[PDB]
Enzyme design. Structure first.
Site, PDB file in Angstrom:
ATOM      1  N   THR A  43      11.646 -31.179  16.081  1.00  0.00           N
ATOM      2  CA  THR A  43      10.225 -30.651  15.008  1.00  0.00           C
ATOM      3  C   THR A  43       8.940 -30.021  15.229  1.00  0.00           C
ATOM      4  O   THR A  43       8.821 -31.022  16.592  1.00  0.00           O
ATOM      5  CB  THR A  43      10.138 -32.356  13.986  1.00  0.00           C
ATOM      6  OG1 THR A  43      10.505 -33.391  13.538  1.00  0.00           O
ATOM      7  CG2 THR A  43       9.139 -31.735  13.119  1.00  0.00           C
ATOM      8  N   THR A  44       9.526 -29.424  14.654  1.00  0.00           N
ATOM      9  CA  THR A  44       8.227 -28.637  15.312  1.00  0.00           C
ATOM     10  C   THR A  44       7.996 -27.371  13.951  1.00  0.00           C
ATOM     11  O   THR A  44       8.384 -27.018  13.711  1.00  0.00           O
ATOM     12  CB  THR A  44       8.712 -26.969  16.888  1.00  0.00           C
ATOM     13  OG1 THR A  44       9.080 -27.827  17.834  1.00  0.00           O
ATOM     14  CG2 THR A  44       8.167 -26.222  16.637  1.00  0.00           C
TER      15      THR A  44
END
Lengths: 204, 219, 197, 213, 216, 123, 199, 201, 199, 198
Positions: I1-2
């Site tokens: 998750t970025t």
């Protein structure tokens, strides 16, 4: 905690040429009292006594290990022990147990065998020796026994003023302790002689 | 408990207070702290009283024979390695907080030993409960290689701040001067608290105690 | 919870114990003997954890018999209690702690009768009378009122029954039958077993 | 998590004289091993004849005092008169019980003169139990203050000695020195002393020096 | 309570003649991370008083929105009154106390300074509700570090000028940066005086690293 | 819900509601009782039987307790509510007090309901 | 706590900070975390400061023996496996993590991460609580064949970047350039830390 | 804490200690544990002190509202049942209160007990507190309903004095209150220790 | 998750990855974490995927109402405080963390991190479990006044760097360029991810 | 733990209960009455938690008295047990759970004698004999041997004493005095209180 199981109180005050030690007679288990004849002071030899408090299991056990080292020390030496020497002996006995330490607060009082000099001291659960120039007390009520001896103590007191001071300090402070009472044994260590008295105390 | 030390141009001085307490109350007002190791090497304990006491006892004992076996001066860095290896052997079970400083063939040196065993060289620091009060005072006013009189005025005020800024720090101030020419002990060098008196006296007359049993044993 | 009681008379020691041994909700053995004989004039009363009561007391039983046979003479009442306390204190910090409550009853040719109180923490204290269990709260108070050093065993046994009948009134557990014996210069003398038809 | 309470130390004393009532406490406010300030007077004056001490968790000492002062005005506006010392004590008993499930953590000491002009000392507990006594103590040094006042004020455990009713001149010097001895052995007591003496003429405050350690 | 993140840093304040200085670092902290290096931790309240805090800054922005609107609502009223520095210190005492009884306490430590009608006020509140008044105050490790520094000066010189105060703050800001790992270099020195609150911009302090050569 | 004041004052202070309620009492059947020495006798007259209506459900003589009985004249519907609620409270008093219910106790437990429900909102 | 090492043609540059903080309070703000195990062999201390200083002496005890028996400087691979086996075997009571780097006459400059008990060779290695946040700079800004001047700046820029973001990192930057002709020790004062974006 | 009461031919006698302690420190030695409800009705205290002071005054409130209402001088039976019902609604919330209600009525000098969980009992002889078991022994020994006025004082006196001797939480001065048809009356207040000196001799 | 956003002169570039993994297994390897709250107002989802999608609809419900009442696009500061108060009040039952960014006619492109319940303005903001490792690149390589082409590469290089180091990040890079004339949506296939040092 | 027992004879129901009420280590009230009268021919036996025993049983006592006064006639034994079970089942999921064990004894003019067993979970089952407490294990087994539907109350009381004397032998708790009553056409009849002049 564990120190509050048997309770107990020990008091030692330093006079001018003499020293006085006092402790109560009560022995009980929590809310259950046992006997009135319990003895918190054991002779270390001439003009030297030691008080003990806390869990009575270690009180009677350490007293035998202190008499273990006392007699062996007196039989090897040709001279009697100094009260300053005994203080460090209790420190070694409690420190070797550092993992399992005994539960007690020994109080050592007596006179310097040199000439007249009084000497007092007390230790802790961790076995830390301490020397005070006024008085030493130990027990569960030790917070109560401070205020009596703080104000009443004087730099120099004769056996007349010393016994009257330590006796009133015991009778007043112990009455406020629930686990302490049932008589007070007072020992007077002088240069010429040694006086033992049993005070009249409330039964409560 | 406030202990501190400062290294100046001609030597090092280790300050400490006189007061020891047990958790609810003051145990002793005049109780001494700084111990003896070597003539030029002194240390002071903190944290657990008996643990810091017995550790310096084993340190002074080990350093005593090192002075007797070598016949030479003792190294200050030798003391610190002895202290932490004992802390490492027990895995931080000993709560002894120790500061070590002195003068050796190299010169004035001050070290620090954390109860976990970590060692750090440093000109000045403080340990104990009141350490943050003395460190802040020593951090601001420190100067490299100060005059002996300039370092004496600063460190005494550092312990004074560590006392007034801590509940477990009180009594007099015991400062010990160590120089290349020799070491000198100053007992109760500073006494910031004047009110040593009281407003009344308590005396008892003979016969006011309810004695029950009485006996006399001659000696 | 098992019950013990003892009384120190001027020349005598009067002790009593409950004979009931129970498990779970039932009483398995109501005649069980809690009294162990350490020496001729020295008895023993041991109660506590069901496993530690019989096991640890039999250790004391032979250890006292060790001394008497080696030197040809038995321990004194004072010497016996102090040796039993160190035995209980040594296993206190071991991996097998012993939960027991002991009363030592014995008579000496010089100091006379002796009664000794001992807890599970091995704290020895001499007392004229002592008791164990929860029933000790309902009994010893009666002894505080009626005890005198000059009392005769004839009245002491009557006062002992008055204390033990309180166990059938306020004290919850039944405990039908009690065992009573006395110690004096003439040795162990059995008394009528207390029975409630 | 969240600790709702912390021990702030301190000590409070109250003694009831014949015609007077004396109440004194220190100025030291400290939590943990650190000092917040050296002047934090705990003694609060409710009415002219009544002074209440507060020793315990400081957050509850501030709020509970403001609640009492709010009910002081409820009374006086309703009853057209000031509360007696005994009426304030029995009031806070029900106030402390209203929290019985989540009790306030405090040790309250109320003192002053009653309608007869005699000192009335009232010691409380967090659950609200109370009693009347000649002298009471409270706080961290409470165990220290009680034995000294038993012998000196109470004349207890003394055989064949003249018993003189408490005098104001001695009562002041006894309260001063027990705190001088307290400031020695109590880490939570010292730095100053404030003595509030309630007499029939009025309240008279005093300030006594103590050790700064 | 649960988990706030958004950790803060220490805050210092002191009294001097005719004014109060309160300084704090601008760094927000998340766990062991230094994340937001530009933050205003010092908030102005009317002319004569000023506020700063520590702990959870997310709860501090909520205290911004609550106390801020309440203060603005008074400026909207225009009755001729302004909240005294004791009133803000009193309202925060009960507002933080009201969160303990509902079992939802906010993590924060606030300091209320101000100067009004020649009366210099500096005060301290806490999540635990402990409240008092002292001439020198600090939060976090500042009470361990910067507090005894100011006590020594106030005992020797109870009266301090505006220049002497800022010089002692920078010396205290210098020490706090050294021994506080969670502190930060950039800080703001804000001073309230007879002219009102004046907040200086980002500042720094000259550090003496000579200990590097003295150790080695 | 329905919330309003029903019984209201008049220029003379009399209550038209309560007065009309007493008129329905006057039109009830004749019932009587008399205190004897150790005995009490209740009676009521019911003339309505052409042999059709059962005599078990007609009874207007009711017992609040073993030591307490009662008889009523008025609307037979309102009596069934009062008798039941009186017995619930009468035995609830024996719950609070081991001793039985004095006749004066329960009479306050009854007339008070006629006090409340008369001045109550919407009742 | 931040340690960094970068290999280049003529040697390696092993940096570290001076900040040592137990808990949230700084024990010493100036400390050298590089403990020499040999002339050209150094060890970057990280993790637990108490366990790292104990291993550094136990590693030096074994390496000095292996060095004197061969009468030649031990290989960098030799010094790395000493720390690893002490780490892997004693990891029960030792939480410390070290980074072994140095120079030898065989392969030249080498950097071996010993962290967590394993061993691997890398052109550049970073460790400590502050090395997690610098992955962005060391990955993108790394270029092959950098001059010794560029390697000193590349190592300094990443360490100075960790000192900003890491709360446990600070003090002064210690640089050690280990080459065949010797080792150069330099200290970067707080004024000489490279300035980055300040907002 | 030691509190006891028993009924016989001449009415109830209530005896209690004066001492209440918190932990190892004695809070107050002079505490008066006996609660005064009505002129002829007498309560006691056990367990928590504040729980007794709060609820026993509510019982005294109910007893006065009763006598102001019906003027029937509420019986001891009705007072004991109302006190038990008030402890039932809050059961499980942590309220700990013991107590004993004493008084005379048309039936006789009733003696009742109310526990913290709502247990209501009736009998000739009751006791409560930490030293209740120490009280049961001396009281039961040498007790009959036919004991006189003077003989029963010696039983009630020795009851507290010998029970508080074996208890660390019991002590102070002995407060003994006899019960009569007109109302209870204070008999004697004497220190336990002062009576210990007479029993040892 | 970025998730990542970078402000520039003419607007902002808000990137995200396509990887959504609950636990150690990928639920969907292609997913758009950018949920439009308005024409120019977007929200970058992060944290808990279940709580973020619930807030995105609750935020859109309030923003559409505020937008229709004014009949004008809401300010970016308006959309940020909606997510914050929903975050701060409901943080008990909601662990999600969002990043609000968009463009308005007042101040232009703006990026407001709503993470953890606070609100602050930044020139560039990054969030998610993978944003912790990219601090090195975004801090040093950031330069003022970058062209829209440089901002697309600067945003892509940092996201592609997170996708390498972050185990929970992967898939394809989603880019959204929000300007005054509209919004451009681009997808970077796995072959077009910028190649970095491979060793 | 308190004890209860009951026996259903052909025309009768024989029940018995322990009169001891104890707290901590002492027995405070040994004459305590555990028997509650629901109706003329309907009794009740309630044991359990000391607080729930008296409180919850008094609720049933008046609730049965509610029915008898409203309709002029008491509940039947079957109707009484089924209404008491719903009362105990409603408070099962509430914040004040009731721990009680009840035996319902009653006689009907048609179905005759009825004995009903009830646990703390409000499970109602009709049985010819039932018992509560830990003493139920030492007693009911004797009933298994000696029970017959044709037994006469003269032998049943003798067999009841044989079961209760087992509580003084194996069963640990004293329980000196037991209360015994019988239910039949002629109403409640008290029996000699069991006394053990120990």
């Amino acid at each position: 905690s564990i120190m509050s199981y048997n309770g107990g109180a020990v008091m030692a005050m330093k006079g001018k040429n003499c020293v006085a030690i006092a402790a109560d007679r009560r022995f009980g288990i929590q809310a259950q009292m046992v006997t009135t004849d319990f003895q918190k002071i054991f002779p270390m030899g001439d003009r030297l006594y030691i008080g003990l408090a806390g869990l009575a299991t270690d009180v009677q056990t350490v007293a035998q290990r202190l008499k273990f080292r006392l007699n062996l020390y007196e039989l090897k030496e040709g001279r009697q022990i100094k009260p300053y020497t005994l203080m460090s002996m209790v420190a070694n006995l409690l420190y070797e147990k550092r993992f399992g330490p005994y539960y007690t607060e020994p109080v050592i009082a007596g006179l310097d065998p040199k000439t007249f000099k009084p000497f007092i001291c007390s230790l802790d659960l961790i076995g830390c020796p301490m020397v005070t120039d006024d008085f030493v007390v130990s027990g569960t009520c030790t917070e109560q026994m401070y205020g009596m001896c703080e104000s009443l103590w004087e730099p120099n007191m004769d056996p007349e003023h010393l016994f009257e001071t330590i006796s009133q300090a015991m009778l007043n402070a112990v009455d406020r302790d629930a686990v302490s009472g049932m008589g007070v044994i007072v020992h007077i260590i002088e240069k010429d002689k040694i006086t033992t008295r049993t005070l009249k105390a409330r039964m409560d | 408990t406030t202990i501190a030390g400062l290294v100046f141009q001609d030597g090092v001085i280790l300050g400490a207070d006189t007061r020891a307490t047990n958790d609810s109350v003051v145990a002793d007002k005049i109780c001494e702290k700084i111990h003896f190791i070597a003539p030029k090497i002194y240390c002071c304990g903190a944290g657990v009283a008996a643990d810091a006491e017995m550790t310096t006892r084993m340190a002074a004992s080990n350093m005593e024979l090192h002075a007797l076996s070598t016949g030479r001066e003792c190294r200050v860095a030798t003391v610190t390695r002895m202290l932490r290896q004992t802390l490492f052997r027990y895995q931080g079970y000993v709560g002894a907080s120790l500061i070590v400083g002195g003068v050796d063939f190299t010169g004035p040196q001050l070290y620090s030993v954390h109860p976990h065993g970590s060692y750090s060289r440093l000109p000045f620091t403080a340990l104990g409960s009141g350490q943050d009060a003395a460190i802040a005072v020593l951090e601001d006013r420190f100067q490299p290689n100060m005059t002996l009189e300039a370092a004496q005025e600063l460190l005494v005020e550092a312990i004074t701040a560590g006392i007034l800024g801590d509940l477990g720090s009180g009594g007099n101030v015991d400062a010990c001067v160590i120089t290349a020419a020799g070491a000198k002990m100053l007992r109760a060098l500073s006494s910031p608290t004047k009110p040593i008196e009281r407003s009344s006296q308590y005396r008892f007359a003979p016969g006011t105690t309810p004695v029950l049993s009485q006996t006399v044993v001659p000696l | 919870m098992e019950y013990l009681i003892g009384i120190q008379g001027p020349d005598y020691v009067l002790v009593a114990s409950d004979r009931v041994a129970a498990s779970n909700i039932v009483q398995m053995k109501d005649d069980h003997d809690k009294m162990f004989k350490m020496s001729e004039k020295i008895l023993l009363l041991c109660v506590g954890e069901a496993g530690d009561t019989v096991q640890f007391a039999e250790y004391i039983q032979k250890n006292v018999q060790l001394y008497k046979m080696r030197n040809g003479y038995e321990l004194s009442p004072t010497a016996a209690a102090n040796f039993t306390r160190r035995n209980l204190a040594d296993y206190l910090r071991s991996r097998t702690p012993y939960h027991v409550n002991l009363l030592l009853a014995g008579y000496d040719e010089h100091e006379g009768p002796a009664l000794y109180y001992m807890d599970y923490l091995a704290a020895l204290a001499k007392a004229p009378f002592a008791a164990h269990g929860y029933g000790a709260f309902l009994t010893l108070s009666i002894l505080d009122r009626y005890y005198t050093p000059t009392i005769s065993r004839e009245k002491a046994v009557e006062l002992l029954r008055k204390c033990l009948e309180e166990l059938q009134k306020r004290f919850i557990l039944n405990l039908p039958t009690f065992s009573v014996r006395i110690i004096d210069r003439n040795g162990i003398h059995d008394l009528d077993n207390i029975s409630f038809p | 998590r969240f600790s709702p309470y912390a021990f702030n130390g301190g000590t409070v004393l109250a003694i009831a004289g014949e015609d007077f009532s004396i109440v004194a406490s220190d100025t030291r406010l400290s939590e943990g091993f650190s000092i917040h300030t050296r002047d934090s007077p705990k003694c609060y004056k409710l009415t002219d004849k009544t002074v209440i001490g507060c020793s315990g968790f400081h957050g509850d000492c501030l709020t509970l005092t403001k609640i009492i002062e709010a009910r002081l005005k409820m009374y006086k506006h309703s009853n057209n008169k000031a509360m007696t010392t005994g009426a304030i004590a029995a009031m806070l008993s029900t106030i402390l019980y209203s929290r019985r499930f989540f009790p306030y953590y405090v040790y309250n000491i109320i003192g002053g003169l009653d309608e007869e002009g005699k000192g009335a000392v009232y010691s409380f507990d967090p659950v609200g139990s109370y009693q009347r006594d000649s002298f009471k103590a409270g706080g961290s040094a409470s165990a220290m203050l009680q034995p000294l006042l038993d012998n000196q004020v109470g004349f207890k455990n003394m055989q064949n000695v003249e018993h003189v009713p408490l005098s104001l001149d001695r009562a002041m010097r006894l309260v001063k020195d027990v705190f001088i001895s307290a400031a020695e052995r109590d880490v939570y007591t010292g730095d100053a002393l404030k003595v509030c003496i309630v007499t029939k003429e009025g309240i008279r405050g005093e300030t006594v020096p103590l050790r700064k350690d | 309570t649960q988990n706030p993140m958004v950790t803060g840093t220490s805050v210092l304040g002191l009294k001097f003649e005719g004014g109060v200085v309160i300084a704090a670092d601008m760094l927000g902290s998340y766990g062991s991370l230094a994340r937001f290096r530009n933050i205003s931790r010092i908030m102005r309240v009317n002319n004569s008083t000023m506020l700063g805090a520590s702990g959870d800054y997310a709860d501090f922005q909520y205290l911004k929105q609550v106390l801020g609107q309440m203060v603005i609502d008074e400026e909207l009223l225009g009755d001729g009154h302004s909240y005294s520095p004791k009133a803000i210190h009193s309202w925060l005492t009960r507002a933080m106390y009201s969160r303990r009884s509902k079992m939802n306490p906010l993590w924060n430590t606030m300091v209320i300074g101000g100067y009004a009608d020649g009366e210099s006020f500096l005060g301290y509140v806490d999540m635990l509700g402990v409240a008092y008044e002292a001439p020198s105050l600090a939060t976090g490790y500042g009470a361990y570090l910067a507090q005894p520094l100011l006590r020594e000066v106030l005992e020797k010189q109870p009266v301090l000028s505006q220049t002497e105060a800022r010089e002692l703050v920078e010396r205290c800001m210098r020490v706090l940066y050294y021994r506080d790992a969670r502190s930060y270099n950039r800080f703001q020195i804000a001073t309230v005086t007879e002219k009102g609150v004046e907040i200086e911009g980002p500042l720094s302090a000259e550090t003496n690293w000579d200990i590097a050569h003295m150790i080695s | 819900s329905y919330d309003r004041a029903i019984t209201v004052f008049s220029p003379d202070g009399h209550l038209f509601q309560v007065e009309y309620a007493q008129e329905a009492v006057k039109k009830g059947s004749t019932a009587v009782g008399v205190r004897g020495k150790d005995i009490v006798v209740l009676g009521v007259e019911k003339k309505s039987v052409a042999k059709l209506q059962d005599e078990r459900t007609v009874r207007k003589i009711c017992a609040l307790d073993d030591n307490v009985c009662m008889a009523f004249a008025g609307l037979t519907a309102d009596a069934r509510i009062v008798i039941n609620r009186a017995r619930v409270e009468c035995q609830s008093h024996r719950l609070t007090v081991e001793d039985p219910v004095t006749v004066e106790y329960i009479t306050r437990y009854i007339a008070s309901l006629k006090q409340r429900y008369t001045q109550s909102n919407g009742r | 706590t931040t340690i960094m090492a970068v290999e280049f043609d003529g040697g390696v540059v092993v940096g570290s900070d001076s900040r040592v903080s137990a808990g949230e309070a700084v024990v010493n703000r100036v400390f050298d975390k590089l403990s020499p195990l040999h002339q050209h062999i150094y060890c970057a201390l990280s993790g637990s400061a108490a366990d790292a200083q104990a291993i550094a002496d136990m590693a030096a005890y074994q390496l000095e023996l292996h060095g004197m028996e061969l009468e030649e400087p031990p290989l960098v691979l030799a010094a790395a496996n000493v720390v690893r086996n002490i780490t892997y075997k004693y990891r029960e009571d030792l939480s410390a993590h070290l980074m072994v780097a140095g120079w030898d006459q065989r392969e030249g400059g080498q950097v071996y991460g010993t962290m967590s008990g394993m061993l691997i060779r890398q052109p550049f290695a970073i460790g400590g609580s502050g090395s997690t946040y610098i992955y962005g700079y060391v990955d993108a800004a790394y270029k092959p064949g950098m001059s010794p001047e560029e390697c000193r700046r590349f190592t300094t820029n990443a360490i100075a970047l960790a000192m900003k973001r890491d709360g446990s990192s600070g003090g002064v930057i210690y640089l050690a350039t280990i080459t065949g002709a010797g080792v150069d020790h330099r200290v970067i004062l707080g004024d000489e830390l490279p300035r980055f974006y300040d907002e | 804490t030691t509190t006891l009461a028993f009924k016989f031919q001449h009415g109830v006698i209530v005896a209690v200690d004066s001492r209440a302690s918190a932990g190892n420190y004695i809070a107050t030695l002079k505490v008066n544990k006996v609660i005064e409800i009505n002129p002829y009705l007498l309560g006691t205290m056990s367990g928590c002190a504040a729980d007794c002071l709060y609820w026993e005054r509510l019982l005294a409130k109910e007893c006065r509202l009763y006598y102001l209402r019906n003027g029937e001088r509420i019986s001891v039976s009705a007072a004991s049942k109302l006190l038990s019902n008030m402890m039932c609604q809050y059961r499980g919330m942590g309220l700990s209160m013991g107590s004993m209600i004493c008084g005379w009525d048309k039936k006789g000098p009733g003696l009742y007990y109310v526990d913290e969980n709502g247990t209501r009992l009736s009998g000739n002889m009751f006791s409560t507190g930490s030293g209740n078991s120490h009280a049961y022994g001396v009281m039961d020994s040498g007790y009959r309903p036919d004991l006189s006025i003077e003989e029963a004082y010696d039983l009630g006196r020795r009851a507290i004095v010998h029970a508080t001797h074996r208890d660390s939480y019991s002590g102070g001065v002995v407060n003994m209150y006899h019960m009569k048809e007109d109302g209870w009356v204070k008999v004697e207040s004497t220190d336990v220790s002062d009576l210990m000196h007479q029993y040892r001799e």
